[PDB]
């Protein structure tokens, strides 16, 4: 499963939904084997709507618990265009290419912050539903 769907997924024990502790959940970065899918082809205008999307404060602490400390405190921000984009604004969209999309999950393990319910992932595939679409 995508490093994106890490942002997305709360517990699913219908009691844990008025903790603020029901996301984003605890990934065992000792047990989540990663995997890189490089087939997914870069566009910037489909990124640059994903990162408007997700909630940063979980990108950090999920990429932290999976070896990634080098994202900034603060969500990147771009202008409103792609003809506006800087080389180094593109530099930015591309390593978030890699970490949330091209990065997978293919084994792994992760829990609710709040009730300590232990979720899988096999196959790349979590035993917790995935939502149809992603928002917060
Ligand atoms: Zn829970």
Not at 9 to 16: G, N
Not at 27 to 34: E, F, T, W
Not at 81 to 97: F, G, K, P
Not at 108 to 126: A, D, F, L, T, V
Request: with cysteine; glycine share 4%; hydrophobic share 40%.
């Amino acid at each position: 499963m995508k490093f994106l769907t890490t942002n997305f997924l709360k517990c699913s024990v219908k009691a844990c939904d008025t903790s603020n502790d029901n996301f984003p959940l605890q990934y065992d970065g000792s047990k989540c084997q990663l995997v890189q899918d490089e087939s997914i082809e870069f566009n910037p205008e489909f990124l640059l709507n994903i990162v408007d999307r997700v909630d940063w404060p979980a990108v950090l602490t999920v990429a932290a618990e999976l070896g990634n400390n080098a994202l900034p405190p603060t969500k990147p921000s771009f202008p409103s265009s792609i003809q506006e984009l800087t080389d180094d604004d593109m530099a930015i969209l591309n390593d978030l290419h890699t970490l949330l999309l091209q990065t997978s999950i293919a084994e792994g393990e992760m829990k609710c912050r709040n009730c300590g319910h232990i979720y899988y992932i096999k196959n790349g595939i979590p035993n917790l539903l995935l939502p149809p679409h992603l928002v917060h």
